[PDB]
Chains A and B, each alone.
Chain A
Amino acid sequence: KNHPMLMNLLK
């Protein structure tokens, strides 16, 4: 949405 750092720490 977009949230590259948040998204990356989630995967």
Chain B
Amino acid sequence: KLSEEQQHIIAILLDAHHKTYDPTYADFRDFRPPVRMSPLSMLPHLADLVSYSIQKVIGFAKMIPGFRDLTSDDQIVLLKSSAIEVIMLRSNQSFTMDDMSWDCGSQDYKYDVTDVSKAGHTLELIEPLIKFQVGLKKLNLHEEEHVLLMAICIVSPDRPGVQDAKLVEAIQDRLSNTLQTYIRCRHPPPGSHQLYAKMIQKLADLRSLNEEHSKQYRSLSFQPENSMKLTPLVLEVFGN
């Protein structure tokens, strides 16, 4: 069932994730603080968190078997397009359905609809994002499946601007097979029912969220006063 190589891929992705995701959120204290009374009083803090998250996503992606072996240009495009999606995925670990919020260890760092509203966004985006998280949490994925889904998301050959798609596809196919085989031999019924199919449908939902966020990011960042509240890395990665 699970070949050595596939076990090796999982071993590497789990190590990578462990090294890029602190489930105590200790570093949150170094962000500009959250204000939950400009109207966007949660923008500074949430931009900082996003920025931070982008750095961790980059660290995770560098450990994806083969990813470092792509050209820089393809590494850059893949990361630019996926960053928001991987941050959304990786956020499922703090998300809680108790009260539909992202619970990052304390009340100060517990984010709900109103916080995200205080970051400049609307309910037309915020609602599908909570719906996304609910559906994804309902999957109750194993950590091995979760890290696999993040990597499969990063190594997508249809991202606009990808130069060597045959090589990106090669990587993702390996991750995909490993994921499919993992579920077959590790994920026991009845949680494994059409599990791959639901996980890949989450990748589709993420593209849709990506598209719409890009639109709102475009209207937010268009105002220089709001752009001023973002980070240099965020400006680079999402654009100006």
Q: How many whole Å from B114's CB to the nearest CB in chain A?
A: 31
B72 is an interface residue with CB less than 8 A from chain A: yes
Q: Is the CB of B232 within 8 A of A10?
A: no
Q: Is the CB of A6 within 8 A of B73?
A: no
Q: Is the CB of A7 within 8 A of B72?
A: yes
Q: Is the CB of B237 within 8 A of A6?
A: yes
- From B62, B72, B73, B232, A5 is in contact (CB under 8 Å) with B232
B233 is an interface residue with CB less than 8 A from chain A: yes
How many A-B residue contacts, CB cutoff 8 Å?
28
Nearest-neighbor residue (CB-CB) of A9 within chain B: B58
Q: Is the CB of B62 within 8 A of A6?
A: no
A4 to B233, CA, bound (A): 9
A5 to B236, CA, bound (A): 8
Q: How many whole Å from A1's CB to the nearest CB in chain B?
A: 6
- Contacts A5-B232, A5-B233, A5-B236: A10 and B58 contacting too (C-beta < 8 A)? yes
Instruction: Encode B165-199 as 1/0 by CB contact (under 8 A) with A.
Output: 00000000000000000000000000000000000
Q: Is the CB of B233 within 8 A of A10?
A: no
B75 is an interface residue with CB less than 8 A from chain A: yes
Q: How many whole Å from A4's CB to the nearest CB in chain B?
A: 8
Report A's interface with B, CB cutoff 8 A.
Answer: 1, 3-7, 9-10
Report B's interface with A, CB cutoff 8 A.
Answer: 55, 58-59, 62, 72-73, 75-76, 79-80, 232-233, 236-237
| 6 extra A-B contacts, CB within 8 A, seeds A1-B76, A6-B79 | A3-B237, A6-B58, A6-B237, A9-B59, A10-B62, A10-B76
Instruction: Please provide the 5 A-B residue pairs with the shortest distance between their CB atoms, ordered closest to farther.
Output: A9-B58, A5-B233, A5-B236, A3-B76, A3-B236
